[PDB]
Design an enzyme around this catalytic site. Structure first.
Site, mmCIF file in Angstrom:
data_model
loop_
_atom_site.group_PDB
_atom_site.id
_atom_site.type_symbol
_atom_site.label_atom_id
_atom_site.label_comp_id
_atom_site.label_asym_id
_atom_site.label_seq_id
_atom_site.Cartn_x
_atom_site.Cartn_y
_atom_site.Cartn_z
ATOM 1 N N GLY A 84 0.745 -1.136 0.016
ATOM 2 C CA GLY A 84 -0.119 0.017 -0.016
ATOM 3 C C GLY A 84 0.771 1.303 0.015
ATOM 4 O O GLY A 84 2.233 1.284 0.086
ATOM 5 N N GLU A 85 0.302 2.515 0.039
ATOM 6 C CA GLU A 85 0.791 3.833 -0.219
ATOM 7 C C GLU A 85 0.016 4.989 0.573
ATOM 8 O O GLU A 85 -1.156 4.554 0.862
ATOM 9 C CB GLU A 85 0.764 4.183 -1.754
ATOM 10 C CG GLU A 85 2.221 4.912 -2.071
ATOM 11 C CD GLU A 85 2.510 4.732 -3.466
ATOM 12 O OE1 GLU A 85 2.733 5.921 -4.058
ATOM 13 O OE2 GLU A 85 2.264 3.810 -4.059
ATOM 14 N N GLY A 86 0.940 5.928 0.954
ATOM 15 C CA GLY A 86 0.222 6.792 1.928
ATOM 16 C C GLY A 86 0.724 8.306 1.455
ATOM 17 O O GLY A 86 1.484 8.497 0.257
ATOM 18 N N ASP A 119 -7.785 9.835 14.843
ATOM 19 C CA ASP A 119 -8.367 9.305 13.702
ATOM 20 C C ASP A 119 -8.565 8.028 13.995
ATOM 21 O O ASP A 119 -8.205 7.056 13.082
ATOM 22 C CB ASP A 119 -7.523 9.808 12.399
ATOM 23 C CG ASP A 119 -8.015 9.433 11.315
ATOM 24 O OD1 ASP A 119 -9.279 9.302 11.001
ATOM 25 O OD2 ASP A 119 -7.007 9.047 10.343
ATOM 26 N N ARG A 179 -10.170 1.768 9.258
ATOM 27 C CA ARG A 179 -8.896 1.927 8.268
ATOM 28 C C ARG A 179 -7.603 2.070 8.962
ATOM 29 O O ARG A 179 -6.689 1.728 8.269
ATOM 30 C CB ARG A 179 -9.283 3.095 7.215
ATOM 31 C CG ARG A 179 -9.190 4.411 7.859
ATOM 32 C CD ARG A 179 -9.481 5.511 6.649
ATOM 33 N NE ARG A 179 -9.659 6.546 7.634
ATOM 34 C CZ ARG A 179 -10.636 7.255 8.271
ATOM 35 N NH1 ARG A 179 -11.827 6.806 7.803
ATOM 36 N NH2 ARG A 179 -10.618 8.534 9.123
ATOM 37 N N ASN A 180 -7.346 2.591 10.070
ATOM 38 C CA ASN A 180 -6.322 2.507 10.911
ATOM 39 C C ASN A 180 -6.212 1.483 11.958
ATOM 40 O O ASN A 180 -5.373 1.504 12.852
ATOM 41 C CB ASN A 180 -6.096 3.932 11.713
ATOM 42 C CG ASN A 180 -6.150 5.110 10.686
ATOM 43 O OD1 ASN A 180 -5.592 4.878 9.618
ATOM 44 N ND2 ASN A 180 -6.997 6.100 11.180
ATOM 45 N N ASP A 192 -2.239 2.425 13.038
ATOM 46 C CA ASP A 192 -1.720 3.657 12.667
ATOM 47 C C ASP A 192 -2.238 4.597 13.753
ATOM 48 O O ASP A 192 -3.354 4.406 13.933
ATOM 49 C CB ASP A 192 -2.178 3.947 11.278
ATOM 50 C CG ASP A 192 -1.568 5.129 10.931
ATOM 51 O OD1 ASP A 192 -0.190 5.365 10.657
ATOM 52 O OD2 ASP A 192 -2.155 6.329 10.689
HETATM 53 C C1 LIG Z 1 -0.731 0.192 3.515
HETATM 54 C C2 LIG Z 1 -1.530 -0.362 4.661
HETATM 55 C C3 LIG Z 1 -1.923 -1.856 4.561
HETATM 56 N N1 LIG Z 1 -0.921 -2.482 5.685
HETATM 57 C C4 LIG Z 1 -0.734 -3.751 5.717
HETATM 58 O O1 LIG Z 1 -1.381 -4.359 4.852
HETATM 59 C C5 LIG Z 1 -0.272 -4.282 6.777
HETATM 60 C C6 LIG Z 1 -0.004 -5.709 7.290
HETATM 61 N N2 LIG Z 1 0.553 -5.725 8.309
HETATM 62 N N3 LIG Z 1 0.897 -4.416 8.714
HETATM 63 C C7 LIG Z 1 1.401 -3.968 9.666
HETATM 64 C C8 LIG Z 1 1.843 -2.586 9.727
HETATM 65 C C9 LIG Z 1 1.117 -1.728 8.639
HETATM 66 N N4 LIG Z 1 0.264 -2.361 7.838
HETATM 67 C C10 LIG Z 1 0.318 -3.708 7.763
HETATM 68 N N5 LIG Z 1 1.070 -0.691 8.852
HETATM 69 C C11 LIG Z 1 0.457 0.443 7.983
HETATM 70 C C12 LIG Z 1 0.957 1.923 8.238
HETATM 71 C C13 LIG Z 1 -1.069 0.355 8.206
HETATM 72 C C14 LIG Z 1 -1.816 0.629 9.303
HETATM 73 C C15 LIG Z 1 -2.952 0.424 9.475
HETATM 74 F F1 LIG Z 1 -3.677 0.626 10.791
HETATM 75 C C16 LIG Z 1 -3.838 0.479 8.318
HETATM 76 C C17 LIG Z 1 -3.163 0.197 6.996
HETATM 77 C C18 LIG Z 1 -1.864 0.353 7.031
HETATM 78 O O2 LIG Z 1 -1.230 0.202 5.879
#
Ligand SMILES: C[C@H]1CNC(=O)c2cnn3ccc(nc23)N[C@H](C)c2cc(F)ccc2O1
Length: 297
Positions: A21-23, A154, A158-159, A172
């Site tokens: 994923g991306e941010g 937030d 989604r977090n 997050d």
């Molecule tokens: C890009 C997305 C997807 N993350 C994972 O699939 C994903 C799978 N494991 N993991 C652990 C941390 C992490 N993402 C993942 N951190 C990111 C910043 C995060 C945290 C969230 F609460 C929600 C989404 C998220 O990132």
């Protein structure tokens, strides 16, 4: 000088497999990490990667790393450490194989255009006991963070992240994800997830643990709608009017009234008239242990 020690990790022990994923801060990758902890000699991890690397972001990054290392709990994604040795800046967490709770919820909903796989949970709708398992886990993480007078600005599905066995952790803390329809742009680099926000925050821009109790209520709603947008028919404008005028989200189809009751309590106009997060969890853990019976029409 003085501070919290953050486990540094050698870049050579981190082999990025592919993007997850991306941010706005940057990207997240699946990665293999060698000799991270003695138990497992090589293992899968999520890796946050920072886009831009000035000393303004390196300051953020450090605080973020300091704070992440302090907050460690059953229902908070495991932080392992950073890696500062050469751009890009990196943060390493446990890999949660069911991704963010919002897409997990959407993948197990009636409107699902595909049927969701996995060996640890049935395709199609979840059990009520499952829904309350999810709800109780998120509350348990909120209870911790309130305990330390931490304010999540937030709190939304989604977090949260979902792991093997339907473990749910807060993932997050904002401090991230680019720009969806959940956020209203009220200025340059000033976007609010206003649908999750209570009156006190919109009206007086005050945010407290009590504000988080309100937004956790919207999360129950997200959970029991299989991750629908609050006020999805409305505009950020029309939503703000609803929140500020005491109009509340209708009970979901798949929501028992004992749960809707807990929601309605999260959504008191007067913060001091809202149930504490401890109380909310209690009633959720209880109902998760003995799911009531519920049908439709
Ligand atoms: C890009 C997305 C997807 N993350 C994972 O699939 C994903 C799978 N494991 N993991 C652990 C941390 C992490 N993402 C993942 N951190 C990111 C910043 C995060 C945290 C969230 F609460 C929600 C989404 C998220 O990132």
């Amino acid at each position: 000088g003085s501070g919290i020690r953050v486990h540094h990790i050698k870049r050579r022990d981190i082999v990025l497999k592919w993007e997850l994923g991306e941010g706005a801060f940057g990207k997240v990758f699946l990665a293999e990490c060698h000799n991270l902890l003695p138990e497992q000699d090589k293992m899968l991890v999520a890796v946050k990667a920072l886009k831009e690397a000035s000393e303004s972001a390196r300051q953020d990054f450090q605080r973020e790393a300091e704070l992440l290392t302090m907050l460690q709990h059953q229902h908070i994604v495991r932080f392992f450490g950073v890696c500062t040795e050469g751009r890009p800046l990196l943060m390493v967490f446990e890999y949660m194989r069911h991704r963010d709770l919002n897409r997990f919820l959407r993948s197990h909903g009636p409107d699902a255009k595909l049927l969701a796989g996995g060996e640890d949970v049935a395709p199609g709708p979840l059990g009520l006991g499952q829904l309350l398992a999810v709800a109780s886990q998120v509350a348990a993480g909120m209870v911790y963070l309130a305990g330390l007078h931490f304010v999540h600005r937030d709190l939304a599905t989604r977090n949260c992240l979902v792991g093997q066995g339907l473990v749910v952790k807060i993932g997050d803390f904002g401090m991230r994800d680019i720009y969806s329809t959940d956020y209203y742009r009220v200025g340059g680099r000033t976007m609010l997830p206003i649908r999750w926000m209570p009156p006190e925050s919109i009206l007086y821009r005050k945010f407290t643990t009590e504000s988080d109790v309100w937004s956790f209520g919207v999360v129950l709603w997200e959970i029991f709608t299989y991750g629908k947008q609050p006020w999805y028919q409305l505009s950020n404008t029309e939503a703000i009017d609803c929140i500020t005028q005491g109009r509340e989200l209708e009970r979901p189809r798949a929501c028992p009234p004992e749960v809707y009751a807990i929601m309605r309590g999260c959504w008191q106009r007067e913060p001091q008239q809202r149930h504490s997060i401890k109380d909310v969890h209690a009633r959720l853990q209880a109902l998760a242990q003995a799911p009531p019976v519920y049908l439709d029409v």
